[PDB]
């Protein structure tokens with residue numbers, strides 16, 4: 087079983103080293119906290135939080151970095167290498183990349199103004215990467231609510247609160263125009279925009295993402311507080327201002343009878359949201375971890391030890 091005190095004897099300063107790395111990076115890249123939280127999410131949804139996503143290509147297995155959900159999207163890998171090297175200096179061969187990324191995700195959330203808590207630790211690193219599994223397990227913005235629920239249940243998160251709270255990760259960070267083009271000009275082959283997108287916001291988004299424009303252009307997930315981790319993401323949904331299809335469906339899907347009350351609850355209280363976010367985050371961080379003597383303590387997060 088994972089425990090928050092796992093490194094209190096072997097590397098008590100690990101959390102501080104991680105925080106310092108992120109604080110420093112945030113000065114030149116204000117998007118890094120959001121990027122790191124997402125890396126942890128994409129790690130945990132593929133064979134569990136085993137740092138499998140950090141592995142680079144080898145002649146025997148392909149990297150998850152080339153998965154449809156990661157390619158030209160996932161970022162911050164060099165920052166993880168930086169904190170890993172710093173931790174290896176402070177405490178040689180002690181902290182696993184999987185745990186390091188979990189702490190990095192929590193510290194990123196806290197630094198962005200979110201809740202502060204000690205994550206369970208003791209995870210170990212995978213001996214391989216899973217590209218096919220990443221392609222099958224990572225959800226997509228065009229997923230219907232039933233599909234989003236299926237995706238979460240598939241990795242072990244049965245609760246709608248898991249889905250609604252964790253989707254709160256979109257309270258900050260960026261999104262490429264490519265992922266909302268259908269919502270803006272031709273949703274579900276209607277030649278019309280997604281009716282669940284507020285018409286005033288629709289005009290704003292069309293200006294940021296014109297037809298035939300730069301699909302890689304970046305837009306903020308949260309129009310209220312783009313870089314602050316707070317419950318504004320849910321207030322947006324209530325006003326039909328969720329950015330991507332998967333965001334708005336939590337409030338507008340015909341299958342949202344169970345998610346709507348959660349959306350409202352989180353929009354109404356920061357405390358209720360933060361509590362639910364920590365609860366869901368720890369549940370996600372508990373997905374099929376390698377523990378004890380299973381796996382290894384990777385020295386270089388990009389490659390398996392040899």
Ligand code: HEM
Nearest residue numbers: 120121124127159225226227252255259260261262265332
């Ligand atoms: C529920 C299904 C989800 C879907 C379909 C989804 C989809 C997306 C998409 C399309 C992007 C934009 C990627 C790009 O433009 O390159 C993105 C970004 C992001 N997502 Fe998710 N996401 C989901 C869940 C989550 C969860 C569970 C978290 C974390 C708890 C999360 C955190 C983030 C963050 C912070 C960003 C911004 C990353 C950055 O700016 O570098 N997402 N997501």
Ligand SMILES: [Ca+2]
Nearest residue numbers: 129132134138
């Ligand atoms: Ca993984």
Ligand SMILES: [Ca+2]
Nearest residue numbers: 257308311314
């Ligand atoms: Ca926000």
Ligand SMILES: [O]
Nearest residue numbers: 124127128255
């Ligand atoms: O994501």
